[PDB]
């Protein structure tokens, strides 16, 4: 059964700390504790070890990523513009 | 502190030129509920190990008893 209506993983915090702070903490802990797709072995086995460290349980690779998600949007647009500049530098 | 399970290796062990002392132990053992037999243990004192040979037959046991060398100081108990 759905035990909580809206608090989810922040149900461990009780009534403390304020609802709007618990909302942000919920949104970041879901990303923090979710599993992700491994870009090398192709499985849903990537988990966070520490802040910025994302290791795959199957193929034992370890990728440096964001603090609570495996890849941040800033890193995505940086990787895109590095790829674009690398194609431009021969042209 | 070692078990020896071979008669000829026991004989070549008893003449190892560091062996001085042996002890022959008689025990009353019960292999089954109806058969009290006698067990003999031949304990040879080497320089770093005590070697025990366990014989469950009295004829073989006494045959080893005359097979012991005469220079070996034996203890009957």
């Amino acid at each position: 059964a759905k035990r909580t209506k809206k608090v989810g993983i922040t149900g461990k915090y009780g009534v403390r700390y304020g609802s709007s702070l618990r909302r942000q903490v919920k949104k970041l802990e879901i990303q923090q504790h979710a599993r992700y797709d491994c870009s090398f072995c192709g499985k849903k086995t990537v988990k966070r070890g520490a802040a910025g460290i994302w290791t795959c349980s199957c193929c034992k690779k370890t990728v440096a990523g964001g603090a609570y998600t495996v890849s941040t949007a800033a890193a995505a647009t940086v990787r895109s513009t590095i790829r674009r500049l690398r194609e431009m530098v021969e042209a | 502190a070692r078990e020896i399970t071979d008669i000829k290796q026991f004989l070549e062990l008893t003449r190892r030129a560091d062996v001085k002392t042996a002890t022959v132990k008689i025990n009353k053992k019960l292999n089954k509920a109806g058969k009290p037999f006698r067990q003999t243990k031949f304990k040879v004192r080497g320089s770093s190990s005590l070697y025990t040979l366990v014989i469950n037959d009295a004829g073989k046991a006494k045959k080893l008893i005359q097979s012991l060398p005469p220079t070996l100081k034996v203890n009957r108990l």
Binding site: Y13, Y17, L21, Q24, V25, L28, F40, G49, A50, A51, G52, I53, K61, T62, V63, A64, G65, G66, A67, Y68, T69, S71, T72, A74, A75, V78, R79, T81, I82, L85, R86, M88, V89 | -
Partner: protein, 246 residues
């Protein structure tokens, strides 16, 4: 009056940084001959967590070109570097994330990190998690490059300074609320003894300029001159303006 707390911090008795569980200074590889005439290839062996630091570190192994042995450098890990990745350091290195190109050989709009100020100090700029340096322009004659720093400042440094291409991993950390004095305790427990902070207005006048009074109030203005002396600089030092702008 007494000697105040920020005045006492400089003796370094109990205010030294707690460095027991740290894995070494995260510096770039030294600029010997290979890095300024060609490149060199190393390997990422492991990405590890550094105590008291928000970003992960990378243990990169190179071969010593002059002796049969292996050198192990500690890099600050860029976001996207994985274990087993080949890292290329040098003047002729290709422009990929993790490579250690000098700033004279990258085009406009490149995002780098762990940037040397002068060529050879092995990393000074944009080293905290999520920070980066953008190359704003080149100047071949009187060979300098303009860069945009994480503070928004624009520096003009040498084009022989090196930088690791990409952004520092572990970004977005400070967006999560700590929620707890225990969490702040465990955060500063591995950095240094600067927490908790007693307000100086809650002290006695022997202990702080702000202390004393029958109500908790500052008294004089809290903006302090730059020419003030030690024991006076408690407040907003050399503030050009104050208040919340809209």
């Amino acid at each position: 009056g007494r000697v105040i707390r920020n005045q006492r911090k400089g003796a370094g008795s109990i205010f030294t940084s707690h460095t027991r569980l740290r894995q070494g200074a995260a510096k770039l590889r030294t600029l010997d001959y290979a890095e300024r005439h060609g490149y060199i290839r190393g390997i990422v062996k492991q990405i590890v967590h550094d105590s008291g630091r928000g970003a992960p570190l990378a243990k990169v192994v190179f071969r010593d070109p002059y002796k049969y042995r292996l050198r192990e450098e500690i890099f600050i890990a860029n976001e996207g570097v994985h274990t087993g990745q080949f890292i290329y350091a040098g003047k002729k290195a290709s422009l990929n994330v993790g490579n250690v190109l000098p700033l004279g050989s990258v085009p406009e709009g490149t995002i780098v990190s762990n940037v040397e100020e002068k060529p050879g100090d092995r990393g000074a700029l944009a080293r905290a998690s999520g920070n980066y340096v953008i190359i704003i322009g080149h100047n071949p004659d009187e060979n300098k490059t303009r860069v945009r720093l994480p503070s928004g400042a624009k520096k003009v440094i040498s084009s022989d300074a090196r930088g690791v291409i990409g952004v520092i991993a572990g970004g977005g950390r400070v967006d999560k609320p700590l929620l707890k004095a225990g969490r702040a305790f465990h955060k500063y427990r591995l950095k240094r003894n600067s927490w908790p902070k007693t307000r100086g207005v809650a002290m006695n006048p022997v202990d702080h300029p702000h202390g004393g009074g029958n109500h908790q109030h500052i008294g004089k203005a809290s903006t302090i001159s730059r020419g003030a002396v030690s024991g006076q600089k408690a407040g907003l030092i050399a503030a050009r303006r104050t208040g919340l702008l809209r």
